[PDB]
Every structure is written in C-alpha cells, then in structure tokens.
Design a protein around this ligand. Structure first.
Ligand code: 9Z9
Ligand code: 9Z9
Ligand code: 9Z9
Ligand code: NA
Lengths: 127, 258, 110
C-alpha cells in the first residue's frame, strides 16, 4: 500500500473498508510485495526472488469465487491467447517455458488490470 | 426545405430550447467542477462516463439541428464555432476511446488527457448562461475598454515576440555547449528567452554560463532586458492608460450630455 | 480613546454613526475594551496591531497624506471589478490545468 501510494500519488480504500484486506484501484498498476517469514526464528525479510503470478479464480463478490479450469487460466493469464480474454498484462521481458506466463520480480513495473471483454471481470455494473 | 427548415428554426430559437440547453450546460459544468477533487472523481467515475455519453448525444442533437436550421449562418457566428470545435473534439475522443483498450497505459497516455481538457472547454459555454442571467455587467466597462485597446496590443505583442525570436535564434547559434541544459534545442532556447522576459532567476543563467562556459552572455542579456522589459512592457502599460483615459473623457462628456 | 468616543456620542448617536472613520475608531476601541472582560481576546496578536490601525485616521489630518488614502478608497470599487475579472479568469485555467496535470505533478495540480 505504501508503494502504490508513492507510485500512483493517491490511495482510496474501499468505501466499506475492511481491516483485514485493503482494496486496490483498477486504474493503478498493482505491484505486490511478498516477504518470507521463518516461524522457528524471528527473522523475516522481503522476498528478493522471481516468481510466476497467475489469477486462478474470480468472484463478483466474496464467497462467489470459482476456480477456473486450466484452459481458462491459460486464456486469462497468458499473452499467447488470441481471444480477447486477458485479465491483466505486465511489461516484463522474462517469461516461462513456451512463453506462456510472465516471470515477475520485485523490480518489475507492476500488474496492469485491463479486463478484456471475454474476461469475467468485464460487463460489471455496480449492484 | 421551406416548411421543415422553418419549423426547425421556430423550434430552435424558441425560448424553451435555449433554457433546456443552458440547463444541460450548467449541469455539465457542475459535473466538470465536481471532477477536480480526486475524492469524488475516483468514486463517481462510473456515473460520470454515463453522464458524459449522455451529454455527447445531447450535443449531437443540438449541433445537427442548428446546422440544418441555419445553414452556413450557423458557421457564421463564433459563439457556435466554439461549440462546433468542442463537438469535434468530443466525437474524436469518443471514437478514439472505442478504438483503444480503456486501461492504465491509456490513462497515463498524454494524448488521452490532452483530448480530455478540451472537454473542459465546454465550461466556456457557461459564460453564455451567465450572460443571460447577467454578470451584472460590472466588468462591462473594463471589458469594453480592453476591447478598444486590443488592436494595438496585438501589434506591440507581436513586435516583442519577434524580438524574442531573433534573440533566441542568435543565442542558439552562439551559446550551445555552454550549459546545454538550458538551450540545447531551439525550442528550449525560445522558452528560456520567454521566461527571461518575466525576470525570474534571470541572473542564474548568467552565473551558470559563467561557471563553465563563458560570460559573453552578459551584454546580450543586459540589452535583451533593456529592450523587452524596459521599453516594450511599459508600452503596453502606456497604451492601456491612454485607452482608459479616452474612456474617461467619453464618460465625462456623456454624463454632461444629460 | 474611550473619552473621545464618548465626546463623539455626546453630539448625537446618529451623526457619530453617519460616518465611516468614527465607526472604525469605535470598532478599534471596542475590541480593545472587551479585553478587560473577556479573556481569549486580550492577547497580543489581536491587541497590538489594532493600536496601529488606529493611527491612520490620525494621519488623515496631514492632507498631503489624506489625498492618497482618499484616492485609494475612491478607486476601490474599480479594483474590485478588476479583481473579479482576474479571479474569473484564473478559475477556468485552474480547471483546465488540473484536468491536464492531475495524476502527474500532483504537488501543484490535484
Ligand atoms: C454581447 O454580444 C456580443 C455579440 C458578439 C459575440 O462575439 C463573440 C465571438 C466569439 C468569441 C470571440 C467571443 C467571446 C468568447 C470567445 C472565446 C473565449 C475563449 O478564449 C480563448 C482564447 C483565450 C484563451 C485563454 C482561452 O480560449 C478562445 C479559444 C475562446 C474564444 C476566444 C473563442 C471566440 C469567442 C465573442 C454581439 O451581440 C450584439
Ligand atoms: C456592446 O457591443 C460591443 C461591440 C464590440 C465588442 O468588441 C469586443 C471585442 C472582443 C473583446 C475585446 C471584447 C470584450 C471582451 C474581451 C475579452 C475579455 C478577456 O480579457 C482578457 C484580457 C484580460 C485578462 C485579465 C482576461 O482575458 C482577454 C484574453 C479576453 C478578451 C480581452 C478578448 C477580447 C474581448 C469587446 C460593438 O457593438 C456595437
Ligand atoms: C456585438 O455587440 C455586443 C454588445 C454587448 C457586449 O457584451 C460583452 C460584455 C463583456 C463580455 C461578457 C463580452 C464578451 C467577451 C467577454 C470576455 C471574454 C473572456 O472570457 C473569460 C471567461 C472564459 C475564459 C475561458 C476566458 O475568460 C472572461 C474572463 C472574459 C469575458 C467573459 C469577460 C466578459 C466579456 C460581451 C452589445 O452590442 C449592441
Ligand atoms: Na522576479
């Protein structure tokens, strides 16, 4: 939240904020930060390593999330899909084998939410 | 062509069509001044796009109907000409939006914002509303005398721009690689000279040049300042004072006329 | 000062109030006076400079000076109109500048 506040010069939380989870604006590029924690010893630090980030489920509301199938995950998270189904896109050169998914890191720009028309996040009107 | 256009007229200049459109324009400007806080624009983003498509449709209505009514006489008046240009910008950014993906990389694209400010230009129509209700004409007199002064204001303004432009050309020719941060490009030469013309930190560029390059810029800058700030801007002041003096003599003779 | 306001009132409440300089001097002396009773006004930021705004009506008797003040006061409404022009001009450009340089350089254009 501190880094999104700094890059995107503004932070607005959900109108009905929840202390457990802060909410991120679809306009702002979402760059998450993870840290590895040792439970045996107190030492906890940021995760300076690469990872593969994917969206594997979605819900119009909480308690409505549904895991997607492998083909759906491919069509949503991978740039190779021709159908306008991508949920997000990031500008990073690293990619996995067969170029299917990006390989992100803490130094990457971030995740840009775009919600093409086939993606489940499309055609959403406030209830 | 004589009955259809004529009824389009007599519905167009109607004393309800104008009020309907001014209600629309005052609503659009209250939205447009709502959108400049970031605490309301970010919340109420989804309703604002709906409302602005609505306003685009309304402006299609008005512009097409007025053109069909009044031929090229519509193009004749400049108040409308402003509206037509605003219309063109609105339709262009509409189609550009549809031909792109409405995402973050387009929010932060400069051309999207540039096309958005021209929407701000719709607020100008609001003055027309303020004119009918009245501005009280409290600044009718000042505006009238500014109106009288402008013909010579334009002339002296373009003369001093010309002086700016010549000095900018020669300064680019001479003082490259002596502080390239300031005027490595012709455009930044011209801007540096223009911002000198307001006398803000103008000694700083002399010192900056003298540090690494050389000081020949001091006679050029002194002569520049002499010509522009000392003999040109004072001309603007002088001509404005004389114009308002004529306004005052007119008022004195007019009040003695009664 | 209070004695002088009393003398002015001694000539008739209304004529003393049929002026502007008298109401100014009265306002100054009254704000000064209430400091004795109330406690949150008897502070230097409110009591010192008023004793200097009391000095202008004194300087008025120095008519090589007074004509300057009279010119300023007479020209004030025209300056109000010019001020209104400038503000009404500034608001429009403020709108345009925000809707351009918002979400970019927000130190000056939010
Ligand atoms: C009272 O009745 C007057 C009527 C004649 C009206 O003529 C109008 C012609 C259009 C004109 C010149 C007028 C007023 C606003 C003017 C606009 C203000 C904006 O200013 C600009 C330039 C300056 C910029 C800072 C902002 O944008 C232009 C783009 C915009 C503008 C100059 C376009 C032209 C407009 C006057 C005769 O009635 C008998
Ligand atoms: C009553 O009928 C009058 C009519 C003649 C009308 O002439 C008009 C010509 C345009 C002119 C000079 C007039 C009024 C407002 C003037 C504008 C006010 C703004 O002021 C400025 C300069 C000052 C700034 C503080 C704000 O912006 C200009 C950008 C803007 C301006 C000076 C552009 C020029 C406009 C008068 C003849 O009818 C028979
Ligand atoms: C043809 O004859 C017309 C005449 C009546 C003329 O009335 C004039 C009254 C002053 C008025 C309203 C007029 C034109 C330019 C107007 C200026 C343009 C500028 O626009 C603004 C606002 C919009 C900003 C974008 C720029 O600045 C104002 C600060 C400035 C302005 C709105 C101040 C008011 C001026 C019309 C009657 O003749 C019989
Ligand atoms: Na200065």
């Amino acid at each position: 939240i501190m880094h999104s506040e700094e890059i995107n010069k503004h932070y607005f939380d959900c109108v009905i904020k929840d202390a457990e989870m802060p909410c991120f604006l679809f306009r702002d590029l979402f760059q998450p930060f993870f840290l590895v924690q040792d439970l045996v010893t107190g030492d906890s630090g940021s995760f300076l390593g690469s990872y593969v980030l994917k969206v594997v489920g979605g819900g119009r509301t909480l308690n409505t999330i549904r895991d997607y199938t492998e083909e759906e995950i491919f069509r949503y998270n991978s740039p190779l899909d021709t159908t306008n189904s991508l949920i997000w896109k990031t500008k990073v050169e690293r990619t996995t084998e067969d170029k299917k998914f990006y390989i992100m890191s803490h130094e990457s720009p971030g995740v840009e939410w775009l919600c093409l028309e086939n993606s489940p996040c499309y055609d959403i009107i406030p209830q | 062509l004589l009955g259809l256009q004529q009824m389009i007229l007599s519905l167009t200049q109607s004393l309800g069509f104008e009020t309907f459109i001014f209600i629309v324009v005052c609503l659009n400007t209250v939205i447009l001044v709502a959108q400049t806080f970031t605490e309301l624009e970010i919340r109420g983003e989804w309703y604002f796009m709906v409302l602005d498509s609505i306003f685009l449709s309304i402006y299609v209505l008005e512009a097409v109907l007025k053109l069909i009514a009044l031929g090229l006489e519509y193009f004749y008046d400049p108040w409308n000409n402003l509206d037509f240009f605003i219309m063109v910008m609105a339709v262009l950014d509409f189609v550009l939006l549809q031909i792109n993906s409405l995402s973050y990389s387009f929010y932060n694209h400069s051309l999207f914002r540039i096309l958005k400010v021209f929407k701000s230009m719709r607020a100008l129509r609001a003055i027309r509303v303020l004119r009918r209700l009245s501005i009280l004409t409290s600044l009718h007199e000042v505006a009238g005398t500014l109106s009288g002064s402008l013909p010579s204001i334009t002339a002296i303004l373009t003369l001093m721009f010309t002086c700016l432009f010549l000095f900018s050309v020669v300064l680019r020719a001479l003082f490259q690689d002596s502080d390239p941060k300031r005027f490595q490009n012709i455009f930044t030469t011209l801007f540096t000279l223009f911002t000198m013309l307001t006398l803000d930190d103008w000694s700083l560029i002399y010192i900056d040049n003298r540090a690494q390059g050389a000081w020949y810029i001091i006679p050029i800058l002194m002569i520049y300042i002499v010509i522009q700030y000392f003999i040109f801007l004072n001309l603007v002041i002088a001509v404005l004072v004389d114009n308002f003096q004529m306004a005052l003599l007119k008022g004195l003779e007019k009040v003695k006329l009664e | 000062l209070i004695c002088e306001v009393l003398l002015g009132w001694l000539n008739g409440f209304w004529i003393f109030w049929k002026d502007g300089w008298n109401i100014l001097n009265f306002a100054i002396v009254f704000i000064l006076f209430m400091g004795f009773f109330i406690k949150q006004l008897d502070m230097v930021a409110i009591t010192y400079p008023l004793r200097v705004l009391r000095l202008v009506h004194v300087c008025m008797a120095v008519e090589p000076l007074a004509r300057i003040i009279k010119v300023i006061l007479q020209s004030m409404p025209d300056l109000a109109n010019v001020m209104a022009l400038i503000l009404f001009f500034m608001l429009v450009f403020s709108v345009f500048g925000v809707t351009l340089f918002g979400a970019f350089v927000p130190k000056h254009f939010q």
